[PDB]
Structure formats: structure tokens, C-alpha cells
Amino acid sequence: GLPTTTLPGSGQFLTTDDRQSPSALPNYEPTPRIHIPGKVHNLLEIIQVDTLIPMNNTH
Amino acid sequence: GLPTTTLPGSGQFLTTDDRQSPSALPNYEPTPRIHIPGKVHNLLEIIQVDTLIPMNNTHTKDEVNSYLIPLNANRQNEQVFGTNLFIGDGVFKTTLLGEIVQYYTHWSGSLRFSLMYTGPALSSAKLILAYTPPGARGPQDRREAMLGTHVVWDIGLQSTIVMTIPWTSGVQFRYTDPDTYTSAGFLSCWYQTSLILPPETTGQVYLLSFISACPDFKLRLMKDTQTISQTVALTE
Amino acid sequence: GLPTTTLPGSGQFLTTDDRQSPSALPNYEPTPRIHIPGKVHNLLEIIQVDTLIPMNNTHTKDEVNSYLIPLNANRQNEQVFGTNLFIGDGVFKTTLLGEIVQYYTHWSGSLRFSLMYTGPALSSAKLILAYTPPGARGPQDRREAMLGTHVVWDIGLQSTIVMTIPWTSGVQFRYTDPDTYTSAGFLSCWYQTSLILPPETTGQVYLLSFISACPDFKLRLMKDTQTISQTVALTE
Amino acid sequence: TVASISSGPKHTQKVPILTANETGATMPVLPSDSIETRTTYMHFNGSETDVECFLGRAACVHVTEIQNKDATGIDNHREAKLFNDWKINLSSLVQLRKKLELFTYVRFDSEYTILATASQPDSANYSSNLVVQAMYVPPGAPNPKEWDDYTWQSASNPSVFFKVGDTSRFSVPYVGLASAYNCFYDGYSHDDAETQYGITVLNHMGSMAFRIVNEHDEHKTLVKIRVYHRAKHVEAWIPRAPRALPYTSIGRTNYPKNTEPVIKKRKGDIKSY
Amino acid sequence: TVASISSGPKHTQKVPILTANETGATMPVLPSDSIETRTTYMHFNGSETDVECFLGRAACVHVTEIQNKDATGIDNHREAKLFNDWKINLSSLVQLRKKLELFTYVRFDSEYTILATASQPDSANYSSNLVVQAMYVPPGAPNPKEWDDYTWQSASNPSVFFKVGDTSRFSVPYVGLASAYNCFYDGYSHDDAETQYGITVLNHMGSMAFRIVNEHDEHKTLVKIRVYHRAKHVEAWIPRAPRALPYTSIGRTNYPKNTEPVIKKRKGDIKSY
Amino acid sequence: GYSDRVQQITLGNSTITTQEAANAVVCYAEWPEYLPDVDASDVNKTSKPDTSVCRFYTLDSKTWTTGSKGWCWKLPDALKDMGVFGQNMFFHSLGRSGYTVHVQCNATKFHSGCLLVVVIPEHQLASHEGGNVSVKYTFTHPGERGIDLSSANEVGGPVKDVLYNMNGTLLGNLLIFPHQFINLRTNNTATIVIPYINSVPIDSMTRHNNVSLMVIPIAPLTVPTGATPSLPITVTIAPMCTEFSGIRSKSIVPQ
Amino acid sequence: INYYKDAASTSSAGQSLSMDPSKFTEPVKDLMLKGAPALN
Amino acid sequence: INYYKDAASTSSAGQSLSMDPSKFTEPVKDLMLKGAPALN
Amino acid sequence: INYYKDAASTSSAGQSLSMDPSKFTEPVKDLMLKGAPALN
């Protein structure tokens, strides 16, 4: 047995943490990828596309 | 599963421990660094800068006057001022040195004590600064003080005299908190000759004293200071 | 996350375990080492230094006299002293050897038993030290003692006689705590000839006995000693 | 590294111990400049006085309170402390504050530790296993109104769920809008005759809400939350006068009226030892 | 390594077993110097008797007590034990003390282990999960006055928070002001006719405070704290006579008046076996 | 025979001479410089008026009396109404600059007095009312006139106890900031070169004062028998490496 | 060894080891040599 | 393998393996040989 | 280092680092050069 010391935070669930976790569906083979146009990689990509401004709030 | 054995201490929160922890803001890109002058890397850096000592405690309330050491004309032999060297208390407690020193438990090294004369240019005087190392009492007359580490300061063109308080101790470290076995000694100043004023000149001339650490200095075992407190949490 | 499995023992505090633990004082710089004579690395080092044995228990209270073995003039055949060899009890219990030995459960090796004569220079005598290995009783007369490991000591210029108690045992280790199967035997001393005093000399001459371990010695299985205790925590 | 070099008698035209402090400089005078010294070494690096160490330990920066009780009939969940929030700042508890305020600008990453302890002031048959949710609510994010809002879904706000009695740990990168955090700011949010003055208008870091996920038990439970802060990867600029007088408010440099003298007064002469 | 060499009959002018202890030396006489021996090996290194092992295990060095109860109306929190402190020293509990005092000077790093156990002497519906805070308060640091002072912010003092029933572990570097710890000190803090004598004026290591973070429950809870010490990276100098008489005070070598004889008295002759 | 004491400083069409100085201070050993590309953010090309704003402007003289407590100016505020420099300040959204501060005060070899001249980056003042009261804009923007520490408190204003640096710190420790003394027996002028010090590349020059300059008498004034019990103190400041960005309408500020 | 992806999650930086007090002790324009008259 | 930065946090040193009893057993000025008269 | 057998159990992919907004900003048939009349 490898001697360890658990640190503060152990047991916590950080919604933002990025770790590995066991797969509930071992050996499952997802459906193949096919080509789909319009792929988005970054939100900074799309905000460069302009949309209309409801400048005339008045209503 | 790798077999492990949790050791005593598991689950504890040591405010002093230094470990890794997951980032709550993954992929966040902090703002770029720009150049900012005056970067400080070590507190030992800044305590080498001297600040004014409120040597003249005598007042009923904090006043500019507590920084002015009075000097009297035509006095001989007499003592100008005195103080023990518990840099973490007394006059020193509010200085930059004392303030920082109090963030640590142990200190060691040499101190830089300076005196700048502010009396009229046409006046003259010769004082004597003395450092009495631990073991005996604070000197009671010039003769006694003069028998130890001292400096005969001749007032003139160069306004300031810098006397060093060479680390003189057996044990290699002293406590910042006033402790007897760890006393640093005494500092006193006397008239070597006497202050002489020119004609049409009357009154009091003052001396400004400064304190700072030499590159000699060492500080260790960080701790909370007795120089700040509160009764209830502050509110906006 | 690396899959692990905690084993039995997790969370336990074994006073004897040797592991790493975070430092409560990060970046602290301890005081430099300086040279200090008399460094001790092993307890086996110091038990080789002999100390005095209070062979003369006989007294109602601890006295210098318990270290003095009386010797009487013009006695023949008679026995001077005797004791079993439970180095962790009896006379030995308070000696440096016994004291240290009691910090361990097992012992093995050879013991060094010395006798220094203090009677007048012009006196003479021949005694005989005998070590009776386990298996029989403590000798009751010189003839019996003489049949085992012994030394005929001639008193003279060289004041001390050093008799060794060669590790004589079947099992390779004995208990420090008096245990019968683990007995070490018996030590006795007798008059080989007899103590003779010079003219105008009267009274008692004494012998001083010492005990120490040979480089032979081994000690193992550390444990608490029966030589110290308290009823309540001490206070300042 | 030498602490002091060997220096003997002296009789020169070179007077090192004579300077003029009105220049504004602290000449590096050494013992060996005013007395005969022997050689000695440092055997010291000054690691414990590095700013990375000075601000490198956890210090409590805030204490707040929330409670697990029947919410039925409560009109203002916030006031009832069904959930409570902390308008993030590091100047509420003075100990760390004085340290940080030893410099003007400061930049670093932070490691937070949240400790929650339970309390049952009046009759309870057991101590319940409550789970706390601490959610960071940045400026602009919808603040929680009820202890079980939609806001606690925290789809984008980050947040942790931990047991009471346990501790929560995570670190945050330097989130300053500038290149460093301002400990002081001699300015305003805009040129207006009445707006606030000080870092009060600068350190607008939002707040983090706390609540207890479990529904209520028969008895009422009082959970007290403590947030600890530890800086790491430190950089500090422009040292300044340490604070002398006590604080009165978060962010302002204000100090109380009729305050006691901070400089000790001598029990005697200026010649007294 | 040989334990005993082969040595046979002897008849020399070289008498090894004849020495003069008044020289102050313990001549290294071996069995093979007074009897015929056979060859035998050690098969032993003496690892268990190395000072690093002798002082290398945890030993209890202090027991104290604190309690979780309603602080309302208590004027002296300290006396009430709402929080209590320990004026650090290793000579309160004798077992370890005798060991350390086998040498004059001693230097090493220390590993502490703090065990806290709970107790409810009178009526309670459950056992609460209390968290203990142990804070090191060095000489010069402000001592806690109330169980919830500002001092517990511990911005610079180091401190641990652990569950009662659990254990706290951490290590401390050699913090001596000198090059080693003094187990004895034949001196005073200064040349004064009334000041204290002994290591009492030397081992001034401050104290560590303990408290229970949680607020009070209906019932009162008694937490007993035990501190254990383990030395590591040991160095010892100047061995000395082991202690014989019982102790009476922390730091002093004093021993009780009218104390019992420590050397056993023989049930008989000096010739008795 | 070049001396620490004699100096000349020329900026734009203005020159300063002093025959009794004590060297000069360069805050944190850094000379002022323009904003380098690597540190910039604001994409606007900046304006560099050079000699038209980087010159010496002399404030109104102050009067040092045996009772004076000290004075406190704030930059860029103090120059807000000075020639083209001021104008640019209001017409631009952003701006950065450094300065050369020259404080003058001569007397005689018979007088005695010691002024502490210091520059304090981000000198956030405290309100005398305590609690959580703010310090209204107008009170930290005294302009050319500056703040007189011996005047009385006023509603909305800052506290003015020289002893506590107007911010809860002790006077004696003001030396940790780039400073210089004017000790009448040694000095007669103090000079301090201030580089741009801020946590942002460029900033608003109306809503934020980067530093404040303080002249504080430590050793009180002393005049010879039967002489006028006062000495004038003059403050001359010159911006340098000044840069303005985002030009427009021209700010209208409180009062 | 770093277990996490972001820089912020790493432990303490370890001593800067630069240490130059001169930018605070000697922020003067004209270099002043120890031993030489401060005001020449 | 050491998990922590400071020396103090490491485990036990392991046997000194020096072992010289002579500084306590034979602290005499003039070397005394075993077998040779202690007092000559 | 991946502790599990399946791809699904691994952590976040890490920045795509492609970033081509043109498929949304300029989905025109005849390339339009900045500065050249949009309608010629």
C-alpha cells in the first residue's frame, strides 16, 4: 500500500473541474462522424457575424 | 485500483501548506503584464531603506514633534537621548523596520542608525553616539558610554552621521518580541563638546534620527503582528 | 483521477511509523551548525564507558557508601561480595549500563566488570573475581567459584583489574527484564590470600567496582523504562 | 556569501559614515565601515522574506452565516439567511489586509479554502449531513433571490458542493482587469461631484453565494462559513508606509475619530532606557 | 564483522586486564583478553540504538482541554476553556524528557501529531462534528483573548483545522536560536539577583492555542487534546548521567524533598545473590 | 569642479538652475519613457505634444510659518489649468505622463528648518468623518492651489492630520516613498523625477490622480532674532514623455 | 509534476532570488560612492 | 522520492554508521596501549 | 496518462485552435476584397 495523505478539497464537486471518470458504457461504439457544414469552434468566431440592432426601442 | 494507505493528517487544512489545486476558471487568460517600476521581491530589500524614528515619545499624543530630538546650546557632558534596542518595541515599534520586523519571530544582523542635524548652517557642535552591547546597564554619563562602540560626530557640511550597530551577540538570533536573554543593548547620545549658536540666533535646533537594516540582516519564522486589530468585521 | 483502494490501517497513527509530512514553517532557515565536541551517534557508544556500581546496597538510604565495597584485613577464604547478573535490576539498575539497557527489551554481548583498589599504597592483597555461568547456583565458597571463569587479581601499582564477563549463553539474546530462562549467571569475589595492612595503619580499605559493555554488545527492541514516572503533568 | 569582511584600523580622507540624508538616499553603510570586524558568513538566503512567501499562506478573509430551516412563510430568503452572499473583497478582515497594503500594486493567483462548520443551538436529535453549495456570481450574473432559484443550476457560474464540517479547495487565476490589483486608488469611477472614492469603485469582483442544498429537518441548523485566501505566483510594486491606525471600512483608508495614540509614550525622559 | 577472535593460552609480560581507572579512561578490554575464545561474528549493526532512532518515534508531550459550550455570559473565555493554550515545552511529560535529557545539547527537526478526542459527560442527543483549530502563537504574536478573536484569522501564524476524533500532522524545522537545543543551561537571562535560573529562560518558544470553531450546541462537549512529538534528523552532544529522582517542575532539575531511595536495598548481605 | 549642489534642468523652453541642491531623485531608479507597443492596449495612435507640454509650470507660492502643517498637491490635477498641457488633459479620454518636480525654498545660514518633499503613488486620502464616508471629487482636485494641511476640515473633504499622512499611516514612514529633504542648512531645493507609475498602460487624467506631492515641515521654521517669521515655498513642475490618446469633446468636471 | 492543465493551479513559485535594494535605497540621479562626500 | 519542498519534511535520516566510542572511553592525552602498563 | 480503457472517459480536448470565421462572415460566391467596391 502506497502511503498517501488526502488534501483539503477531497470529496468536493467542482462543476468546473476537468478530470477522467470511468465509462458507464464500456466497449460502446459511437456512430461514425459524417461531414456537416457550418462547424463552429469558437464563440469568437460567430460574434464577428453582424446582426440587427433594435436601436428603435421606443415601442 | 492502486492500493494506498491514508496517513495521519489526511483531511487537515494547514494554512501554511503549499500544494496544487484545481482551477475554478479553466482556460481563463489573465491580463498581460506591463512594466511597473518599483518592484519588490523581498522584505529584506525594503527594510534597508531608513525611515524616521519617533525618538521623542514624551508627548501626550502622536505629533510631528515626536520625531524631533531637541538639542540645547551651551551644555557640556550631558546626554541628548537614550533607548534600549528592542527593535520590536519602544520608539522602533512604528518605524518601517520595527513594523516589518514584527512580522517575524527571529532577527539577526546589523542595524543602521543615522542622525541628521537641522540647526542653522552657522552653528556648530560635536556629539557622540554610543552603542552599549548587552551585559551591562545603559550608560549614565559620557565616560561610561564612550567605553563601548561609539562614533564622534562632527557637525558640518555633510549633514548626516551614520553609526552602525554591529551585530554583537553570542547566540546567532534574537527575538523580535522583547525578551531579556535576547536583549540587544542600549543606544545613547551625548555632547562631545557642545552646541554653539551664532549671533542673533536663538532657541532650539533639532536632530532627526533614522533606522534601517544592513545587508547583514536576517529575519525568520513569520508570525502575526501586534500592530493591527479589529473587534468586528469591517463593512462597506 | 487515479483509481485507488485504501487498505486497512488507513487513518491510523503509529507512533513508530516514519513518513514525510508537510512543513508548518515553509522557507524557514534554521541556524547554522557550529562545532560542538562530544557528539554521540549511538547509545552503544556510551555504554562502553564504565560507571560506578552501587554494589553495597546494604544502606537504608542512597549514600556515597553504597559504592564502597568493604575489604577486611587478615581474613582468609572468605567472600568479599556477590550478585546475580540481571543487568537490568539489582545493583546494576541505576548504573549507566543498566539505565540504558532498560530502554531495550533484548541484550547480548560481553560485559566489562572492573575493580579499583583504594587501600594504602603500602598494603597488599590478592583477590579473585569469578563469573559463574547459568545452570548452577551462585558459588558458596572460593573453591566452587574458582571452578568457573575467573581472574586472580594481584593488587599493586596498576590499581584496577578488568575482568570480562564473556557472553556465555545458548540462546543468542537475553531479556533486560529479569527472566529466569534468560539468566546471565553470578558474579562473586573472594580473598585469594588476604588483605595485609602496614604498621600504624588501621581500619577499612574499600574497593570501587565499575560496569561497562564491550564492543561485543547488542541491544534491541526499544521500550519504555521502569526508571521514571509521574502522577500528574508537571507545571512551570 | 560574506556577512562581514575583515577590516582593521582606519585613518583616511574617505569618510563613509558621513552622508546627507536630504538627498533621499540610504547609503549602504556597513559595520566594517565604522569598526574593526572579523570575517563572518551569512548562512542565510532570505527565503522566508520573499514576497512569494509573505503572502503565500492561507489567511481568513471572510466569515458569514447561512441556515437550514423551514422556508415556508419566509418572504425574504436572503434576510432569513436561507442562503447568504459575500460581496467579494480582501479588506474585510484586517490581518491579511495590512500585509497586502504593504505595497501599492499587487498581482498573483489565489488559492481559496472554504470551511463550513455546523451548529444546533437548540434541541436536535442528531446532527445532519448537510451539503453546501458555494457559487461564484460574477458581475452581471443573476443573483439568487430564493434558496432554490434557477440560478443555483449554475450552468456557467462555477461552484462547489461540499459537506459541512469538510473543506472546499480550489484556485483562481489573477482575475484583475488591469495588469495588477490596486490596493489603493486615488480616483473615481467618473468625473461626478458625488460618486464614491477609492478602490471601492475598482474592486468590483461580484460576490459568491452560499446555501445548503438539503431541504429542512425538524430542528434548525446553523452553518457558519469561513473563506481563506492564499496568494501564489506573487508580484508586488511600490512599497508604502504600513498602516498605523485601525480600519473603519472596506476599501476606504478612513480611520476613526478620537483614536488612541499609536506611538508609545515614554514612561519618563527622552534619556530613559 | 567479528564479535570475538580466536584466542588461545597466554603467558606474557603484556597484561591487558591490568589498568588504572584513575586515568579516567575505560580501556577496551575484550573477552579474548582474559579467556580462550573461538571465532564469532556480530550479525548486528546497532541500528536500533542510533540516536536517530532513539528519539525517532512519537511520544506524547502534552495533554490539554477545551470545550464547546455557550459563551454567553462568560467573562474570561480562557478560564472557561472556550479556548485554551499550551506554553510549548518538551519537559512536561517525563518519559520523553528523560530520553532527551540523556544528552546536554540536542538538535533535530520535529514532526508533531495532534489527537483530539470528544466527550459528552452529561445528556446529549448526538455527538457533534467539531473542527479544531490549533494555531501556533510565536513570542510577540498577539495572544487570543476570546474564542473568536481577530487573532484566529491567523494571517501569518501557521495553524491547522481538523476534525475531532481525527488527527493533525505536520513537521517543524529546528527552530532553535542557537546551533542546538539546550537540555540544560547553567545560567540566567541577565546578571540580576532575583531572575529565574535554568533552561526556563532559554526555551521561550511561545505557545499554541486551541479552540473549537463550531458555535455551541444545546449540550456541552468536552474535547481533550494530546500533542505528540517525534524527532527526525537527530544530532546529540555531551552525554550525561541519566535522571534518577522524579521531576517536580518544567525546566528545573529540582527534585522533591523527602524522596524515596532510588537505589534498591539488598534483602540481605553484600554477599547475597 | 562639478558638484551635486549645482544643477540645471531644461525642458521645452524652460530652464531651472539651483546652486544648493542635494543631488536629485529618480523614483525607483527609472527615468520616464513613452508607452512601448508591447504594453499598449488602446489602439489609438497617441499624440506627443513634446515641448509644448513638457515644460516647467510654477504653481502659486506657499507661505511657511512657524505654525504651518504642510501642503499636498496631486498630479496631474495640479497642472489641470496649465497651458497646453491642461487643455490636452480635458480634450482627451486618456493620457499618461511623468514629471520632474522642483521644490524651492531659500533662507540664510542663520535660519533653520527642514521640509520633507515626497511623491506618493496612489495616495488615496481618508475622510475625517471616519466610518465609511467618501471624499468628494472637488476635495481631491484642489488644482494649482493644492491642499493646505493646516486648514480646517470641511464637509465632504479629507482628513488633514500631518501625523497620519491623511491616510492612516505614520508620517515617519513616508520615507519609503521616493523623497528628498530641504534642510535649510544644506539645501534650498529638492528635485524628484517621476516616471509613469500605474497598473494600466495609459489612464484617464481627470478621474484618477497618479501621485500626490507633499511638502511637510518636520523640523519647524526658525528665523533669526527680529526677522520676518516666514519663508516662501515654491513648487515648479514639468511633465515629460507626455502622451495623450482618444481626442474628443472636452470633459466637464465637477465644479 | 503538475496534475492540472492551468498555470494558476500550480504551487508556490519558489524564491525570486534577485534582491536589488538599490532601486529604493539609492534612487539618486548622480551615483554616490560610499566614502566620497555625499555633497561635493 | 520527496513530495515536499523543505528538508524538515523528509523522513528519518537512516543510521549514522560512524560509531567511535573512543572520544568518551579514551579521552586521555597520552595514548594508552592495551596490554602496556597504564602507568609507566 | 489515461487510467481508463475508453475514449469517453478522458478529460477535456483542449483548444481546437482552428478559428475560421469566414464560413459565416463571408459565405459569398464571388470573393469580395476589402477596399474594393462590394458591388462592382
Ligand SMILES: Cc1cc(CCCOc2c(C)cc(-c3noc(C(F)(F)F)n3)cc2C)on1
Ligand atoms: C483585491 C482583490 C483580489 C481578489 C481576487 C478575488 C477572486 O475572486 C473570485 C473568488 C473569490 C472565487 C471565485 C470562484 N470560482 O468558483 C468558486 C466556487 F464556486 F467554488 F466558489 N469561487 C472566482 C473569483 C474570480 O479580489 N479583490
Ligand SMILES: Cc1cc(CCCOc2c(C)cc(-c3noc(C(F)(F)F)n3)cc2C)on1
Ligand atoms: C526543547 C524544545 C524543542 C522544541 C520545539 C518546539 C517546536 O515548537 C513549535 C510547535 C510545537 C508547533 C509549531 C506549529 N506550526 O504550525 C502549528 C499548527 F498550527 F499546526 F499547530 N504548530 C511551530 C513551532 C516553532 O521546543 N522546546
